[PDB]
C-alpha cells in the first residue's frame, strides 16, 4: 500500500493539494489535526494530554502527537496513507519508518506575495466566529464551514525541519516545489500519484475510494 506524505507551512497550498489528491485518487486525508479532532471528541487519554495545550492556544509537544499518530496509523496498516503535515521532526520521521516504508514525500512552499500576510493554520467562518485550527479541529471540507457551507478565511499570524527534508531527500523519495500557484504544481503531483494509484474516475469502480466497502 501507498504511504505518501505532504509537508509545508501554512499558506503553501497544502490544504488545496491534499483535497485534490483525496478526490482524484480516493485516499483518506490523514493528519494529526484530524485524529485529534476525533480523539478530543471521544476524550481519549491522548486527546486529554493535548487538550491542555490547545485550550491555552499553545503547541502540542511533538511526542504527544507521535504517540497519537503511531496508535492511529498502526490501526490503519491495511489501507493507503495520505499523511498531511507529519512528520515534522526527525524523531517523528524515524518513528514513522518503524511502521512503514514511505513511498513519496511532497514538500510545498509559500509563494512570495503570500508571505507578507504571514498566514496561520486558523481558518475562521466570519459570520459565526467559528475557528477551525487545522492542527486540532479541521473542517470536513478544506476552506469551508461545516455548518453553513460558506467559505472560511485563513487568519494572519516552519513545520518543515531541514533534517526531515534531508532524510527523505537521501532516500530519494522527496519531491519539492517552489512557492508558486498550486495549479502550476498540480499536474506534476497528479503524475506522481498516478504512477502508484490509478485515478479513480477512470476505473470501473468509478470514484470509489480504496477504503470503501458497500
From Swiss-Prot:
**Could you tell me the keywords of this UniProt record?**
Acetylation, ATP-binding, GTP-binding, Kinase, Mitochondrion, Nucleotide-binding, Transferase
- In short, the EC number is 2.7.4.4, 2.7.4.6
Cellular component terms (Gene Ontology): cytoplasm; mitochondrial matrix; mitochondrion
Q: What residues bind AMP, as annotated?
A: 32, 37, 58-60, 85-88, 92
Q: Which GO terms describe its biological process?
A: ADP biosynthetic process; AMP metabolic process; ATP metabolic process; cellular response to hypoxia; GTP metabolic process; nucleobase-containing small molecule interconversion; nucleoside triphosphate biosynthetic process; regulation of oxidative phosphorylation
Q: Where is this region: LID?
A: 121-157
Its recorded reaction(s) are: a ribonucleoside 5'-phosphate + ATP = a ribonucleoside 5'-diphosphate + ADP; AMP + ATP = 2 ADP; GTP + AMP = GDP + ADP; CMP + ATP = CDP + ADP
Residues with N6-acetyllysine modification: 158, 162, 169
Report the enzyme's class at the first EC level.
transferase
Q: Where is this region: NMP?
A: 31-60
Domain remark from Swiss-Prot or TrEMBL: Consists of three domains, a large central CORE domain and two small peripheral domains, NMPbind and LID, which undergo movements during catalysis. The LID domain closes over the site of phosphoryl transfer upon GTP/ATP binding. Assembling and dissambling the active center during each catalytic cycle provides an effective means to prevent GTP/ATP hydrolysis.
By sequence similarity, the record places it as follows: Belongs to the adenylate kinase family. AK3 subfamily.
Q: What does this protein do?
A: Broad-specificity mitochondrial nucleoside phosphate kinase involved in cellular nucleotide homeostasis by catalyzing nucleoside-phosphate interconversions. Similar to other adenylate kinases, preferentially catalyzes the phosphorylation of the nucleoside monophosphate AMP with ATP as phosphate donor to produce ADP. Phosphorylates only AMP when using GTP as phosphate donor. In vitro, can also catalyze the phosphorylation of CMP, dAMP and dCMP and use GTP as an alternate phosphate donor.
Q: What is the protein's quaternary organization?
A: Monomer. Interacts with SLC25A5/ANT2.
Q: What is this protein called?
A: Adenylate kinase 4, mitochondrial
Organism per entry:
Homo sapiens
Taxonomic lineage is: Eukaryota, Metazoa, Chordata, Craniata, Vertebrata
Amino acid at each position: 500500500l501507498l504511504r505518501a506524505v505532504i509537508l509545508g507551512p501554512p499558506g503553501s497550498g497544502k490544504g488545496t493539494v491534499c483535497q485534490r489528491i483525496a478526490q482524484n485518487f480516493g485516499l483518506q486525508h490523514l493528519s494529526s489535526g484530524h485524529f485529534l479532532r476525533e480523539n478530543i471528541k471521544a476524550s481519549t487519554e491522548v486527546g486529554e494530554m493535548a487538550k491542555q495545550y490547545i485550550e491555552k492556544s499553545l503547541l502540542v509537544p511533538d511526542h504527544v502527537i507521535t504517540r497519537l499518530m503511531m496508535s492511529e496509523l498502526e490501526n490503519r496498516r491495511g489501507q493507503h496513507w495520505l499523511l498531511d503535515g507529519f512528520p515534522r521532526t526527525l524523531g517523528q520521521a524515524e518513528a514513522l519508518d518503524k511502521i512503514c516504508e514511505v513511498d513519496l514525500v511532497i514538500s510545498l512552499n509559500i509563494p512570495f506575495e503570500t508571505l507578507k500576510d504571514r498566514l496561520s493554520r486558523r481558518w475562521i467562518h466570519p459570520p459565526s466566529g467559528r475557528v477551525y485550527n487545522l492542527d486540532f479541529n479541521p473542517p470536513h471540507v478544506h476552506g469551508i464551514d461545516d455548518v453553513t457551507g460558506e467559505p472560511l478565511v485563513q487568519q494572519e499570524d516552519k513545520d518543515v525541519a531541514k533534517p526531515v527534508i534531508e532524510l527523505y531527500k537521501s532516500r530519494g523519495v522527496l519531491h519539492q516545489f517552489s512557492g508558486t500557484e498550486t495549479n502550476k504544481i498540480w499536474p506534476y503531483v497528479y503524475t506522481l500519484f498516478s504512477n502508484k494509484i490509478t485515478p479513480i474516475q477512470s476505473k470501473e469502480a468509478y470514484l470509489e475510494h480504496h477504503h470503501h466497502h458497500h
